[PDB]
Design a protein around this ligand. Structure first.
Ligand SMILES: [Zn+2]
Ligand SMILES: [Zn+2]
Lengths: 633, 590, 496
């Protein structure tokens, strides 16, 4: 089996696995690291971002004064934001056959692969995954749109200028394959190419393989995959959460007893205590509200938002802050709430029982009923009619480089009393908040993570004991933040081979057996026979019939094994009718003479030889005799 | 082998329960009661399945199809005072909705019959705590060898066909189902799995139901006639299934015709039913699950709750009411209120139980018990069952090996048996209740194979030497745990036995005047000329090689007229050696 | 220059996966060669190919194909690729890369004979693999390098071989051969039937396209197109909806058939019950699944109904009952097909529900489509004209915005058939047989709507200027003055 890893990102993978006669690729990363590097897109053009000064080449040859701009001693690129792609040219994705999805964050990059490249096979994902993915791509395409900034620069994308530029523009990787954003017809094309699957569903591919998804528990419908043939097992685990969360809990029973385990989607901040930082969030939120300002929280419309609103529901009941309202602003807000509402069977047992006792599983429907939390699609209109101060706003995009988030903190940047709270760990908040610096806004960084830490990784691997482990180089290596700490690296016996962006591995396995079926009449015909205690064997003579890579045998040249004894030979010749047979002995063999047809036979250790005259019927009699005095293989 | 014993629905309807023994495992498909027997005979007989033994020891797993009373009414009776603690498998919607129906039936049984040994609400809660829920297409292993799989059905919401497969053995139990896509329930879809058995119902097998769309066109045009005449419309339906189907139909039609006349829906079960219909969207087909992006179809803009003063409030009126068979009849109360008018209308969309007041209304006399009816009636057929062509389509898609008919009437069952046996030539079985039927299986036992041996034999098959016996050889190593097929050489090197070599050397006596070196040259030339496409080579020490057969002109014997040719060969080419000795016994050319 | 520097850098680095992948990715993603140095770069690549890392070799082959896509190289690269294919039998990845390079070379520029495609075809035929290695790719190679207008044995065997993927690739090659012509035969029809019965998905989807194309090629079996059409319908009743959409569009593309077989498809009904009151292919394929197969079915029905002058009534009822299909796309397509088939067509009873259709909530598209239907339709009875008028006036007085379309459809009705309205002329406008009737309102839209119908009727028949009153005379003057494109020129005594 062979593995091609097309993403150096630890969280956003593309893994092309070649097994037997099929090709199965997993996940789709759309790295917004280049998005972090590009300039933000104001919904309404702010004067300061309009007149940001232009950083200049020290040589002065290139037109980087208008290709690039500078702010607070730091430099950014001025265009529409780009997105980093996985390297598609390592393997022809047309020859790549079947695509699996873990979760919506891992399906963000799907129209790129599914429209332009020429892939034409089938794609699998669960229902909540595919629906929340459609909502996310709708939000993303809207925000790259809704104001077209068609400017694009390329002389900075020249390699020499990239070398001359300072970090992190010096630290930019694979600038050449960065692309502009995709559109609704592309979205609909991929989302019609999709097919559906539930948990523990066995999907057969060509008889060659069978795939099953299991609840990882990180997100609503987030799923680890299991690919098996009848002797071979690959467990692909990406982004599980074994803590008590809202989705279905993680299921390791089918995960164990695996030949090859690939592990991705681990935590980004290992030292983060989730519930503790959630409590710190609530305390800081109460402090800002009591001070009388406005709080911003950028968040994806799944997962962490639901957990945050539940805890804020309990905390607002605790602190008695029913005066200050909550506004959830995103063009996907209404459909996100409704989809989280009806997706019930994918939840955990507490929420399923909540469904079974006629109430909605999430409390934010009751929050809407009590009118504390109001959802709004865009900031223009009735939201502008109903805005309040002091206030709470959960805004659409967490990467901060486009949307209602950037407009709101352009509005609120001058004030100090207001507060921004980061809640998603997928980006460095320093490089996120660099363009607005200097900033009077209070910034409190309390990231929320549910991906399993290395202690739980060690526990899970010691529970399941796979034969081979595959993990990223960033998980093998110590982090630059705390290289002194030892528990921050994955430990496994045997040590897992690593991989880098666009790398090829050949996994340590050799294909030996596969699954074939016998047919009952042929099994009736076959009679086993025993040469060794506990070993009974039978020679076979059949016709193979193989349709759709599944194999069966039906009735329509074996050789010998075993030495023949001379004493039993002559005894059975005498009792069969042969007479006047004389035996002489040698150093290792016996020479036996039969006077009829003048037959001389020498018997040695793994050596027998019969010499006679031109005779036929005696020869074939001796043929059947010597062949029936041995075991057939 | 396959053992099938229906405890109920044997040449009959109601109290359906089927016991299936596959490879010594006990799967109990469905357990409900039926109306008509106020005796204990409405419940399935338990004196055969366990006699008076332990239900969890004898039985192994329970499968429940859908939430109709005749299918999930007997779970607390089967599992609580009789005693059962094993696994019960049933879908999340059916799990959410069966206890409410059970509670209503419990209260109604108290208020009507008042059976002393009757299941109580607390142990109903205990039973629904004991049950286990399963998603669609989710292969659930009851234990290591037995697994179950669910298929979308369309009889009602949450309904599920079930495929039970152990090893290669497969029995597909349809339960109740439909092919016609409802206005809010999708059609039944199945894999082409080729089951060994197909257990199915055929409630409407002698009636080819015609075009559904034109049927509600007729319903809508007549209800439009009535509301344009300003009359009152009373629809007696039971509050599950067809009630919300007609609700969605009238919501669509009323919104599109832009009318303003108030309509009302029967209370009591409306809030619970509509809550479950709202909270179980991903079962109500792709129309509603696509429309869910903008709006929610189950949120009704024109449908409110019925009021008894709104009953005698005047004006045109449309009210859905309960029940469909009119035994208790708040619908019958409003019927008695509105029977004097000749302007008003009722539609009866279901088959009424004969011999009751619903049968009196279905029949054409004015006097029903006595009151005389004047308002107009219609008898429509909005049933969500399967028809004859739908059953033929289902069996043709599924391609099973044998079928078994339940849940219907005997002459109809026989007609379907005759038609299916004329059509697809597939064996059919007609069990009576309490009758066990046994069917033989083909238990193909798995075995392993060496991949290299497989690769070279498949290469030989792909080579254009097909249709000739290539004689797949090897041997089966048996451990009683992993039966495997290996090559002879692989078996030799695995088991450590010596590769025995058998050699035959025949002394061909050649009688001619040619010289012995020329005799060996003649042997080489003759074998090369006769054996076409054979590896005939002349070894430079004077020898002849034909594949792996070595011919050597031996030492001169004591007879000058006889020359000895030693022809030496192994057992593997010994057919070729025998042919060579036959040709040399015929002799060299001279 | 740059290619030589890249080759020297690759040779100097010589890292196993790392520098090889980096150099290949840089050379591919930087630019095209855009010169004649592509041959020298290919020579350097062929020199470097004699090494390990077959993945890197396949990447190099893909880069060679991408370079050949600029059509710089031809025969020398073809000979080098032939040598590499002959001497490079190393597993599925390199075999696939060689096949892709061969396809790129064949389809890149030459498109000619004399060992430009025939030699490559013979090489592919000789180098057909043993297990999924090239089989699909060499099948599409022979498809895109179809030899001449004279492979049938080997495609017949590759129809019955192992893998469904290989079968589908063979079928796609059959698409390519038919779009290049190649004049397939009837043994292809027989093996296409046995490929319709293939127990597997999407193999059916493309094989039924093949059965359609051979049936439309020629109708000579015993009845070939009727047998193919029946197979198509018994395939329409399959569960797979993608297969059904394909099926319905292709059977609509089918245009000639036995008429009696077509009514056998429509045969089963409340339609004929309602007809007496007044006096299984499509009947499952319309109300089988949702709007995809519904739209495909109605387009099939419109195409073959435009083909067949008969047969229209038995789909007229099947459209008038299938207006209210609760999907507005299906609604609009139903109205459009009723328009497109509405010729030699009577609606002696169906006028009532087809006009209860134009009474509608907002549905501006639906109401406009129904106005187009009523303007392009035909009717037979005076009573039908009367009721069409009265509910059209209902529509105008209920939604007083589309009165322009109302007036134009009434105009088209009067122009289409004038003689039907003649007895209604005393009744539709009150002209009390001896009294002086009060003058009607001039700009009242209802009265305008009836007047324009009257004048479009009076275009041909001359026997109603005497029926007109004096207000009708001056109103004809005013309407001809105002709405020039709605009323025609007439021969009234007041206006010469
Ligand atoms: Zn039922
Ligand atoms: Zn039933």
């Amino acid at each position: 089996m062979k593995l091609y890893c097309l993403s150096g990102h630890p969280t956003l993978p593309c893994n092309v696995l070649k097994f037997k006669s099929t090709t199965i690729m997993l996940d789709c990363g759309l790295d917004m690291t280049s998005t972090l590097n590009f300039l933000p897109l104001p919904l309404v053009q702010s004067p300061r971002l309009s007149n940001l000064p232009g950083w200049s080449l020290k040589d002065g040859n290139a037109f980087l004064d208008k290709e690039l701009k500078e702010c607070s001693g730091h430099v950014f690129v001025d265009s529409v934001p780009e997105f980093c792609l996985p390297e598609t040219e390592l393997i022809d994705l047309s020859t790549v056959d079947v695509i699996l999805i873990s979760n919506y964050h891992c399906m963000m990059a799907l129209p790129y692969i599914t429209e332009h490249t020429g892939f034409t096979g089938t794609v699998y994902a669960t229902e909540p995954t595919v629906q929340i993915g459609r909502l996310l791509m709708e939000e993303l395409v809207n925000f790259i749109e809704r104001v077209p900034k068609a400017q694009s620069a390329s002389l900075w994308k020249n390699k020499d200028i990239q070398r001359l530029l300072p970090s992190p523009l010096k630290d930019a990787v694979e600038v050449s394959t960065w692309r502009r954003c995709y559109t609704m017809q592309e979205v609909n094309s991929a989302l019609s190419k999709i097919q559906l699957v539930g948990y523990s569903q066995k999907i057969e591919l060509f008889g060659a393989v069978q795939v099953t998804p299991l609840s990882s528990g990180y997100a609503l419908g987030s799923s680890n995959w299991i690919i098996q043939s009848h002797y071979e097992k690959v467990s692909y685990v990406s982004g599980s959460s074994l803590l008590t969360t809202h989705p279905q809990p993680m299921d390791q029973a089918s995960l164990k007893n695996s030949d090859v385990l690939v592990l991705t989607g681990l935590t980004q901040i290992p030292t983060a205590n989730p519930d503790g930082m959630v409590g710190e969030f609530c305390s800081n939120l109460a402090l800002t509200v009591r001070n009388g300002g406005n709080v911003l929280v950028p968040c994806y419309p799944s997962g962490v938002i639901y957990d945050l609103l539940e805890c804020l529901y309990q905390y607002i009941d605790s602190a008695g802050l029913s005066s200050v309202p909550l506004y959830f602003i995103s063009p996907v807000a209404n459909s996100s709430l409704e989809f989280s509402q009806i997706f019930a069977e994918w939840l955990c047992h507490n929420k399923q029982s909540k469904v079974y006792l006629p109430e909605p599983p999430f409390p934010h429907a009751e929050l809407i009923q009590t009118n504390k939390l109001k959802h709004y699609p865009s900031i223009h209109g009735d939201f502008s009619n109903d805005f309040r101060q002091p206030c709470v706003v959960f805004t659409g995009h967490p990467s901060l480089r486009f949307g209602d988030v950037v407009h709101f903190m352009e509005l609120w940047g001058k004030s100090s009393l207001n507060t921004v709270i980061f809640t998603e760990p997928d980006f460095s908040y320093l490089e996120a908040l660099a363009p607005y610096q200097p900033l009077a806004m209070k910034c409190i960084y309390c990231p929320i993570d549910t991906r399993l830490n290395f202690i739980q990784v060690s526990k899970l691997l010691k529970e399941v004991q796979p034969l081979h482990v595959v993990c990223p180089e960033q998980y093998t290596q110590p982090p630059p933040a705390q290289s002194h700490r030892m528990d921050l690296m994955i430990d496994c016996q045997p040590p897992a081979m690593s991989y880098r962006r666009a790398e090829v591995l050949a996994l340590p396995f050799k294909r030996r057996y596969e699954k074939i079926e016998i047919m009952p009449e042929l099994a009736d015909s076959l009679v086993p026979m025993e040469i060794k205690p506990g070993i009974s064997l039978a020679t076979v003579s059949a016709v193979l019939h193989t349709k759709d890579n599944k194999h069966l045998l039906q009735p329509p040249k074996p050789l010998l094994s075993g030495s023949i004894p001379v004493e039993q030979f002559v005894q059975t010749l005498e009792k069969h009718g042969f007479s006047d047979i004389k035996v002489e002995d040698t150093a290792k063999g016996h020479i036996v003479l039969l006077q009829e047809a003048e037959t001389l036979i020498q018997i040695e250790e793994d050596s027998t030889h019969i010499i006679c005259d031109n005779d036929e019927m005696l020869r074939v009699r001796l043929r059947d005799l010597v062949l029936k005095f041995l075991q057939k293989f | 082998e396959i053992r099938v014993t229906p405890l109920g629905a044997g040449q009959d309807v109601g109290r359906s329960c089927i016991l299936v023994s596959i490879a010594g495992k006990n799967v109990m498909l469905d357990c409900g009661m039926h109306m008509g027997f106020n005796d204990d005979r409405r419940f399935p007989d338990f004196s055969y399945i366990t006699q008076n033994g332990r239900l969890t020891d004898f039985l192994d797993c329970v499968i429940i199809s859908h939430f109709h009373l005749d299918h999930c009414g007997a779970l607390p009776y089967f599992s609580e005072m009789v005693g059962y603690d094993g696994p019960i498998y049933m879908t999340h919607p059916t799990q959410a909705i069966c206890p409410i129906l059970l509670e209503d039936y419990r209260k109604i049984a108290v208020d009507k019959k008042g059976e002393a040994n009757f299941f109580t609400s607390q142990m109903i809660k205990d039973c629904m705590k004991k049950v286990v829920a399963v998603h669609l297409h989710q292969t659930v292993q009851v234990d290591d060898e037995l697994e179950i799989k669910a298929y979308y059905a369309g009889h009602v919401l949450g309904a599920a066909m079930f495929q039970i497969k152990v090893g290669s053995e497969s029995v597909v139990y349809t339960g109740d189902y439909n092919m016609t896509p409802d206005r809010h329930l999708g059609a039944a879809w199945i894999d082409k799995c080729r089951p060994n058995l197909l257990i199915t119902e055929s409630t409407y097998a002698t009636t080819i139901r015609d075009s559904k769309r034109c049927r509600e066109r007729d319903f809508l045009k007549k209800v439009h006639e009535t509301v344009e005449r300003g009359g009152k419309v009373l629809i007696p339906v039971f509050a599950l299934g067809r009630a919300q189907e007609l609700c969605i139909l009238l919501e669509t039609f009323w919104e599109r015709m832009n009318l303003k006349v108030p309509i009302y829906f029967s209370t009591g079960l409306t809030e619970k039913a509509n809550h479950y219909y709202k909270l179980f969207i991903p079962w109500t087909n792709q129309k509603i699950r696509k429309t869910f992006v903008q709006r929610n179809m189950f949120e009704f803009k024109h449908i409110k709750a019925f009021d008894r003063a709104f009953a005698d409030n005047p004006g045109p009126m449309v009210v859905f009411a309960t029940p469909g068979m009119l035994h208790a009849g708040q619908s019958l109360q409003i019927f008695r209120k509105w029977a004097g008018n000749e302007k008003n209308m009722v539609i009866m969309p279901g088959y009424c139980v004969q011999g009751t007041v619903g049968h009196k209304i279905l029949s054409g006399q004015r006097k029903l018990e006595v009151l005389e009816v004047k308002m107009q009636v219609e008898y429509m057929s909005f049933s969500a069952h399967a028809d004859a062509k739908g059953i033929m389509q289902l069996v043709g898609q599924a391609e099973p090996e044998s079928v078994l008919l339940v849940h219907g009437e005997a002459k109809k069952m026989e007609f379907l048996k005759q038609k299916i046996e004329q059509e697809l030539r597939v064996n059919c079985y007609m069990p009576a209740n309490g009758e066990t039927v046994t069917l033989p299986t083909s238990p193909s036992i798995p075995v392993g194979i060496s991949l290299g041996l497989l690769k070279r034999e498949m290469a030989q098959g792909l080579l254009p030497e097909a249709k000739k016996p290539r004689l797949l050889h090897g041997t089966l190593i048996m451990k009683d745990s992993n039966f495997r097929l290996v090559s002879s050489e692989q078996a030799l090197k695995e088991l450590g036995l010596a590769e025995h070599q058998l050699r035959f050397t025949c002394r061909v006596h050649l009688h001619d005047t040619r010289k012995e070196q020329e005799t060996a040259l003649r042997v080489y030339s003759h074998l090369k000329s006769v054996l076409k496409d054979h590896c005939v080579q002349h070894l430079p020490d004077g020898s002849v090689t034909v594949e792996s057969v070595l011919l050597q002109a031996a030492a001169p014997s004591e007879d000058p007229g006889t020359k000895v040719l030693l022809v030496s060969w192994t057992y593997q080419d010994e057919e070729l050696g025998s042919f060579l000795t036959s040709l040399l016994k015929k002799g060299l050319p001279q | 220059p740059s290619k030589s520097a890249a080759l020297h850098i690759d040779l100097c680095k010589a890292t196993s996966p790392a520098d090889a992948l980096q150099y290949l990715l840089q050379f591919a993603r930087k630019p095209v060669e855009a010169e004649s140095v592509e041959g020298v770069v290919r020579i350097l690549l062929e020199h470097y190919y004699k090494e390990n890392d077959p993945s890197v070799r396949l990447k190099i082959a893909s880069l060679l194909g991408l370079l050949s896509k600029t059509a710089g190289f031809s025969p020398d690269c073809i000979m080098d690729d032939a040598i590499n294919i002959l001497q490079n039998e190393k597993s599925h990845q390199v075999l696939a890369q060689l096949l892709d390079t061969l396809l790129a070379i064949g389809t890149k520029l030459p498109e000619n004979q004399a060992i430009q495609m025939r030699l490559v075809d013979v090489a592919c035929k000789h180098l057909t693999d043993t297990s999924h290695g090239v089989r699909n790719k060499c099948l599409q190679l022979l498809g895109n390098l179809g030899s001449l207008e004279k492979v049938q044995k080997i495609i017949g065997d590759y129809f019955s071989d192992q893998d469904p993927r290989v079968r589908t690739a063979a079928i796609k090659a059959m698409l390519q051969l038919h779009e290049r012509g190649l004049k397939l035969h009837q043994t292809i029809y027989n093996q296409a039937c046995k490929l319709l019965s293939d127990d597997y998905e999407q193999v059916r989807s493309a094989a039924v396209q093949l059965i359609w194309v051979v049936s439309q090629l020629y109708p000579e079996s015993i009845r070939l197109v009727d047998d193919a059409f029946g197979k198509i319908c018994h395939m329409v009743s399959d569960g797979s909806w993608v297969v059904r959409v394909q099926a319905a569009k292709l059977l609509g593309s089918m245009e000639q058939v036995s008429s009696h077989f077509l009514e056998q498809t429509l045969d089963k009904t409340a339609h004929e019950r309602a007809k007496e009151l007044y006096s299984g292919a499509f009947v499952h394929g319309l109300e089988d699944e949702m709007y995809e197969v519904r739209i495909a079915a109605v387009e099939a029905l419109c195409m073959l109904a435009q083909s067949s002058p008969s047969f229209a009534e038995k789909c007229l009822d099947f459209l008038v009952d299938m207006f209210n299909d609760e999907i507005e796309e299906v609604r609009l397509q139903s109205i459009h097909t009723m328009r497109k088939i509405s010729n030699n067509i009577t609606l002696r009873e169906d006028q009532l529900d087809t006009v209860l259709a134009v009474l509608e909530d907002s549905s501006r598209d639906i109401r406009e489509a129904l106005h187009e239907l009523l303007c392009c339709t035909n009717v037979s009875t005076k009573e039908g004209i009367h009721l069409a008028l009265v509910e059209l006036l209902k529509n105008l007085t209920k939604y007083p915005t589309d009165r322009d379309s109302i007036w134009k459809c009434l105009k088209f009705l009067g122009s289409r058939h004038p003689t039907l309205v003649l007895p209604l002329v005393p009744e539709l406008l009150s002209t009390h047989p001896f009294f002086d009737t009060a003058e009607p309102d001039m700009d009242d839209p209802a009265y305008i709507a009836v007047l324009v119908l009257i004048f479009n009727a009076a275009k041909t028949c001359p026997t109603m200027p005497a029926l007109f009153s004096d207000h009708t005379f001056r109103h004809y003057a005013y309407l001809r003055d105002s709405l020039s494109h709605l009323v025609p020129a007439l021969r009234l005594p007041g206006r010469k």
